[PDB]
Design an enzyme around this catalytic site. Structure first.
Site, PDB file in Angstrom:
ATOM      1  CG  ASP A  88     -47.228  18.667 -44.949  1.00 20.94           C
ATOM      2  OD1 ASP A  88     -48.055  18.010 -44.950  1.00 20.94           O
ATOM      3  OD2 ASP A  88     -46.352  18.785 -45.958  1.00 20.94           O
ATOM      4  CB  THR A  89     -51.344  16.442 -41.275  1.00 22.50           C
ATOM      5  OG1 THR A  89     -52.072  16.497 -42.703  1.00 22.50           O
ATOM      6  CG2 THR A  89     -52.138  17.619 -40.424  1.00 22.50           C
ATOM      7  N   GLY A  90     -48.842  15.682 -43.525  1.00 22.60           N
ATOM      8  CA  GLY A  90     -48.129  14.535 -44.186  1.00 22.60           C
ATOM      9  C   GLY A  90     -46.700  14.593 -43.967  1.00 22.60           C
TER      10      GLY A  90
HETATM   11  C1  IPF Z   1     -50.751  21.090 -57.823  1.00 21.94           C
HETATM   12  C2  IPF Z   1     -49.371  20.892 -56.858  1.00 21.94           C
HETATM   13  O1  IPF Z   1     -48.217  20.321 -57.481  1.00 21.94           O
HETATM   14  N1  IPF Z   1     -49.522  21.342 -55.681  1.00 21.94           N
HETATM   15  C3  IPF Z   1     -48.391  20.969 -54.648  1.00 21.94           C
HETATM   16  C4  IPF Z   1     -48.101  22.421 -53.939  1.00 21.94           C
HETATM   17  C5  IPF Z   1     -47.286  23.326 -54.588  1.00 21.94           C
HETATM   18  C6  IPF Z   1     -47.851  24.764 -55.137  1.00 21.94           C
HETATM   19  N2  IPF Z   1     -46.904  25.408 -55.736  1.00 21.94           N
HETATM   20  C7  IPF Z   1     -45.740  24.682 -55.948  1.00 21.94           C
HETATM   21  C8  IPF Z   1     -44.462  24.840 -56.306  1.00 21.94           C
HETATM   22  C9  IPF Z   1     -43.269  24.077 -56.485  1.00 21.94           C
HETATM   23  C10 IPF Z   1     -43.728  22.638 -55.766  1.00 21.94           C
HETATM   24  C11 IPF Z   1     -44.941  22.376 -55.026  1.00 21.94           C
HETATM   25  C12 IPF Z   1     -45.990  23.389 -55.029  1.00 21.94           C
HETATM   26  C13 IPF Z   1     -48.743  19.802 -53.720  1.00 21.94           C
HETATM   27  O2  IPF Z   1     -49.856  20.036 -53.247  1.00 21.94           O
HETATM   28  N3  IPF Z   1     -47.583  19.008 -53.489  1.00 21.94           N
HETATM   29  C14 IPF Z   1     -48.150  17.919 -52.698  1.00 21.94           C
HETATM   30  C15 IPF Z   1     -46.785  17.670 -52.027  1.00 21.94           C
HETATM   31  O3  IPF Z   1     -45.909  17.191 -52.299  1.00 21.94           O
HETATM   32  N4  IPF Z   1     -47.065  18.134 -50.789  1.00 21.94           N
HETATM   33  C16 IPF Z   1     -45.981  17.961 -49.534  1.00 21.94           C
HETATM   34  C17 IPF Z   1     -45.932  19.211 -49.121  1.00 21.94           C
HETATM   35  C18 IPF Z   1     -45.149  20.042 -49.851  1.00 21.94           C
HETATM   36  C19 IPF Z   1     -45.934  21.121 -50.406  1.00 21.94           C
HETATM   37  C20 IPF Z   1     -44.972  21.879 -51.396  1.00 21.94           C
HETATM   38  C21 IPF Z   1     -43.802  21.808 -51.472  1.00 21.94           C
HETATM   39  C22 IPF Z   1     -43.068  20.703 -50.859  1.00 21.94           C
HETATM   40  C23 IPF Z   1     -43.530  20.081 -50.354  1.00 21.94           C
HETATM   41  C24 IPF Z   1     -46.853  16.878 -48.611  1.00 21.94           C
HETATM   42  O4  IPF Z   1     -48.030  17.534 -47.974  1.00 21.94           O
HETATM   43  C25 IPF Z   1     -46.065  16.125 -47.681  1.00 21.94           C
HETATM   44  O5  IPF Z   1     -46.624  15.652 -46.507  1.00 21.94           O
HETATM   45  C26 IPF Z   1     -45.455  14.913 -48.540  1.00 21.94           C
HETATM   46  C27 IPF Z   1     -45.970  13.824 -48.541  1.00 21.94           C
HETATM   47  C28 IPF Z   1     -45.849  12.897 -47.324  1.00 21.94           C
HETATM   48  C29 IPF Z   1     -44.481  13.651 -46.923  1.00 21.94           C
HETATM   49  N5  IPF Z   1     -44.225  14.551 -47.738  1.00 21.94           N
HETATM   50  C30 IPF Z   1     -43.024  15.417 -48.135  1.00 21.94           C
HETATM   51  O6  IPF Z   1     -42.732  15.997 -48.669  1.00 21.94           O
HETATM   52  C31 IPF Z   1     -42.381  15.442 -46.686  1.00 21.94           C
HETATM   53  N6  IPF Z   1     -41.620  14.184 -46.637  1.00 21.94           N
HETATM   54  C32 IPF Z   1     -41.595  13.144 -45.564  1.00 21.94           C
HETATM   55  O7  IPF Z   1     -42.145  13.770 -44.710  1.00 21.94           O
HETATM   56  C33 IPF Z   1     -40.988  12.253 -45.662  1.00 21.94           C
HETATM   57  C34 IPF Z   1     -42.048  11.078 -45.608  1.00 21.94           C
HETATM   58  C35 IPF Z   1     -41.477   9.742 -45.918  1.00 21.94           C
HETATM   59  C36 IPF Z   1     -41.176   8.536 -44.943  1.00 21.94           C
HETATM   60  N7  IPF Z   1     -40.412   7.665 -45.499  1.00 21.94           N
HETATM   61  C37 IPF Z   1     -40.311   7.975 -46.743  1.00 21.94           C
HETATM   62  C38 IPF Z   1     -39.850   7.274 -47.897  1.00 21.94           C
HETATM   63  C39 IPF Z   1     -39.462   7.607 -48.913  1.00 21.94           C
HETATM   64  C40 IPF Z   1     -40.355   8.859 -49.404  1.00 21.94           C
HETATM   65  C41 IPF Z   1     -40.778   9.681 -48.298  1.00 21.94           C
HETATM   66  C42 IPF Z   1     -40.814   9.124 -46.943  1.00 21.94           C
HETATM   67  N8  IPF Z   1     -40.146  12.110 -44.674  1.00 21.94           N
HETATM   68  C43 IPF Z   1     -38.647  12.002 -44.587  1.00 21.94           C
HETATM   69  C44 IPF Z   1     -38.010  11.789 -43.479  1.00 21.94           C
HETATM   70  O8  IPF Z   1     -38.325  12.213 -45.746  1.00 21.94           O
HETATM   71  C45 IPF Z   1     -41.214  16.450 -46.626  1.00 21.94           C
HETATM   72  C46 IPF Z   1     -41.945  17.845 -46.565  1.00 21.94           C
HETATM   73  C47 IPF Z   1     -40.469  16.405 -45.164  1.00 21.94           C
HETATM   74  C48 IPF Z   1     -48.399  16.766 -53.612  1.00 21.94           C
HETATM   75  C49 IPF Z   1     -48.260  15.393 -52.904  1.00 21.94           C
HETATM   76  C50 IPF Z   1     -49.594  16.902 -54.271  1.00 21.94           C
END
Ligand code: IPF
Ligand code: CL
Ligand code: NA
EC number: 3.4.23.16
Lengths: 99, 99
Positions: free
Chosen positions: B25-27
């Site tokens: 996860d690059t995000g």
């Molecule tokens: C259609 C769908 O909903 N798909 C989901 C995937 C999924 C399939 N089955 C599930 C069943 C249950 C739950 C989820 C799913 C999907 O693709 N979800 C995406 C998603 O949230 N993806 C995450 C990774 C992920 C996947 C699945 C479950 C949980 C998490 C992103 O790739 C992921 O990159 C997101 C976006 C940016 C950061 N971030 C995160 O969740 C991360 N937060 C971070 O990295 C934050 C970033 C940040 C800095 N300052 C902030 C201030 C406020 C809020 C956030 C931040 N840092 C910290 C330290 O918290 C955490 C994993 C650590 C969204 C953006 C569409």
């Protein structure tokens, strides 16, 4: 480009004529942008992440440029903490993860 | 490898003697694994994203083998729906986004 990950992979996007910053996010199925006005009808979608689920507005066939690359696809609008370019558009710009 | 993004970039990891599936996860700033035991002291952290925040435990200097590539760094443990390899370990295995 080749984008390393020491810093967040934030790029400029263009949508609706406007430049925004967004994260290239391989962990995202879909592309989710902060509230803005987009044309046409939308459909409901629920997305899930680290903290639970949210309702977003799904707009299809939206023209969006990502780091200078043109894409046309689905954009979700809603209470995302950061603009996220997900795999639906990463594939359109030919992005891969390599190591 | 070169990982295309048509599908979720899920790989096998080994952490704490346990094999798990995790999302590259690059995000993600951080690496977050579902509940498990890890060695050493920890401190609590709140991480945010779609849907809000969850509380996790932060462990440092943890080794994870990621698709055969060992990395060491901070690993967060908590009620994540998906095990996530974030940038703090992706950098260590030399992962880049390319397009
Ligand atoms: C259609 C769908 O909903 N798909 C989901 C995937 C999924 C399939 N089955 C599930 C069943 C249950 C739950 C989820 C799913 C999907 O693709 N979800 C995406 C998603 O949230 N993806 C995450 C990774 C992920 C996947 C699945 C479950 C949980 C998490 C992103 O790739 C992921 O990159 C997101 C976006 C940016 C950061 N971030 C995160 O969740 C991360 N937060 C971070 O990295 C934050 C970033 C940040 C800095 N300052 C902030 C201030 C406020 C809020 C956030 C931040 N840092 C910290 C330290 O918290 C955490 C994993 C650590 C969204 C953006 C569409
Ligand atoms: Cl490097
Ligand atoms: Na342009």
């Amino acid at each position: 480009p080749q984008i390393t990950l020491w810093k967040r992979p934030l790029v400029t996007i263009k949508i609706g004529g406007q430049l925004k910053e967004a994260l290239l996010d391989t962990g995202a199925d879909d592309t989710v942008i902060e509230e803005m006005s987009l044309p046409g009808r939308w459909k409901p979608k629920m997305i899930g992440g680290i903290g639970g689920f949210i309702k977003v507005r799904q707009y299809d066939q939206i023209i969006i440029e990502i780091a200078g690359h043109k894409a046309i696809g689905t954009v979700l609008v809603g209470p995302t903490p950061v603009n996220i370019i997900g795999r639906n558009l990463l594939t359109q710009i030919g992005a891969t993860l390599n190591f």
